[model samples]
Target chain A: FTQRERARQIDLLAFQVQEISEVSPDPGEEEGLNTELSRLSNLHTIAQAAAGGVELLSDGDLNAAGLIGEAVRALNAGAKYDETVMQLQNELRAALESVQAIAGELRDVAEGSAADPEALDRVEARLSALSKLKNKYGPTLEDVVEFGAQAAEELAGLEEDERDAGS
Target chain B: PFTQRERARQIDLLAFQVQEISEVSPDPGEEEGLNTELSRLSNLHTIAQAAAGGVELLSDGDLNAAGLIGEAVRALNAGAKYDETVMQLQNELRAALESVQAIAGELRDVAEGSAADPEALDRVEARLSALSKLKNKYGPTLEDVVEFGAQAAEELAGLEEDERDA
Candidate 1:
C-alpha cells in the first residue's frame, strides 16, 4: 500500500476498484468465497490500522501502538474457526476440480503429444497457471478452456494499463 | 450407479412377484405404485438433463462445491428450506414427464406383445414397485433421492479425500 509518486494513479485506480467491490451487493451470502472474500477484504482495513500501528511504534507513540496491536490481535482471533472451515472447504473443492480438469485435458494433450510424465506435469502446471485473475471461467480446469481466450482478452485491459504506466 | 443397481434389482424381484399374482382378477394390484414410479423416472430424466448443463457449466469451482456443501449441511441441520432443495420439483415436472415417456416407450413393447396377460401387467407393476421401494428409502420419489444423493456424493468425495469426517 506504499504510495510512491509514480504509483499515485495506480493507487487511485486500485482504491476505486476496492470501493466498487465493497459497495457491491453480497453476490449471495451462500456464494461462499464471494461472500467470504468480502468479509476478509473488509478486515483489510485492519491491515491499514496495523500499518498505522507500525508507524506509531516507530514514532514513540506507545499508547497508540498498544490499542492497534490489541485490535489486530482480536480481529485475527475472531475469524479463526470460520476461516478454517472455508479453507478446508475450498481445498476439497479444488481437489475435485483438478481431477476432472486433468481428465479432460488429457484427451486433448494426447491428440498431439505422447502425454508422458512430463506432459502430465505440463497440464498440472497449466492448471495452477490458469491465469484468470478471478471467476471468469471458474475454479475448475474444464471450466478454464472455453473462456480462456475471452478471459485473456478481458485481462489485457488491466495488463495494458499497468504496462502503459511503465516509464 | 450403486443406486441404479438397487433399482434394477427391484425390477428383477418385481418380475417374480408377477408370477405370484398371475391369477388375480380385474388386475386389482400394484398399478398405482408403478404409475407413481413411472412419474419418477420421468422426473429424473429431466434432472439428469438440467444437471448435465450444470456439469458442462462444470459448476466445478471450489466456490461452487464449498457452497454446495454449506447448503447441504444447512439443509441437514435445519430443513430443505436451508438451501437443501435437491432440485425444484415444480420446474422438473416436465423433465420428469419426459423420462416418464421414455419408460412408457419401453413398457409399450411388452404391452403390445402380452398386452392382455395379467402376468405381463404384473411385471410392469413389479418393476415400478422395485423402483419405488429403492428410491422410497431416501425421499418421496426417485428424483428427490437422486438430487440429494448426487450432491452429497460430490461433497462427500471431496470431504473423504480430506478426511473431513475422520
Candidate 2:
C-alpha cells in the first residue's frame, strides 16, 4: 500500500485538512447565524415597540390597565344590587391582570434588547466567517462540511500511504 | 405473546402520552367559552361604547329619543280628548314610549355587562391558544381532546398493570 509519489501531496494536503477539521459541524449553523444577525440588526426597532407597548398597557395612568381598573371599581360599587354588574366587574379584573401580564412580557423584550449591540457585532462576525468557509470549500454550509469531511478522509489516506512508504 | 422489551416500551410510551395529556388538562368544553371571552375582550371598548351610546340616545340624555317620544305622547294625549282619531294616535304614542323605555333598559344592561378589560382579553386569548394547540394534537374539539386524554390514561393504566404482573 506504500506509495512514494503520494508523499509530496500529503505535505500540502495536511494544512488544508487541519483547517477543514475546524469547520462548523452543524450544517444549519450558518443559517442560524444569518437569522440572528438580521434580528440583531433590527433590535432597536423591536425594543422601542416593546417599550412603547409596555407604557401604553401598564405604565401610563390613563392606559388600558388603569382604564380597566376604573371600570372594575365602578362595576364593583354597583355589583351588590346587580348580578350582571358583579360578573362584568370580575371580567374587567381578569382583563386588568392579563394587560399587566402582557406589559411585563413586553418589558422583558425591551430590557433584553437594550444591550444587544455587542450581540449584533458577534453575529455579524460569525456570519462573515461562515461565508468565507462556504466560499472556500463549497457553495452551501452542508456542502462545505461535507467537503471538509472528504478532505479529512483524503488526507488520512495520503498520510497512511506516506507512513507505509517510509524507511 | 409480546416480548418483555415490546411491552415495556409500549408502557413507557403510553405513560408519556398520559402524562402529557394530564399536564395540559384540557377541559371538556372550555375552548368555546375561551374563544367567546376572547372575542368579547378584543372588542371590549367597542361593545362598551355601543351599549352606552344606545342607553344615552334612548334614555340617559335630557333630550333623549325616548324623552322626546314621551313628550310627543303627552301632547297627543292632551288633544286626544278633543277627537276620536286623536285618542287612537295617543294610544300608539304611548305604545311607542313603552317600547323605547324597554329598549333603553336592555341597552343599560348591555352597558353594564361590558368593561374595558385588557388583561381578561389576554388571558382568554392565551387560554384559547393553548386549547387550539391541544385540539391540533388530539382534537377537532375540546371535548374530543378531553376524551382522548381519558382514553390515553386508561390505556396507560392497563399497560402499567400488565408490566407489573410480568
**What are the lDDT figures for the candidates, one per model?**
0.36, 0.63
Binned by DockQ into CAPRI classes (incorrect, acceptable, medium, high), candidate 2 is: incorrect
Predictions: Cα RMSD each: 35.8, 38.6
For model 1, the chain A TM-score is: 0.19
For B34-152, candidate 2 gives per-residue lDDT tens digits of 77777656656555565565456556855454554444445444334433444554465455456556645764776676667978778777777777788888888878887887887
Which ranges of candidate 2 are over 4 A from the true structure? A1-167, B45-114
DockQ of candidate 2?
0.01
Residue pairs that clash (backbone atoms under 3 angstroms), model 2: A94-B120, A95-B119, A95-B120, A98-B119, A99-B119
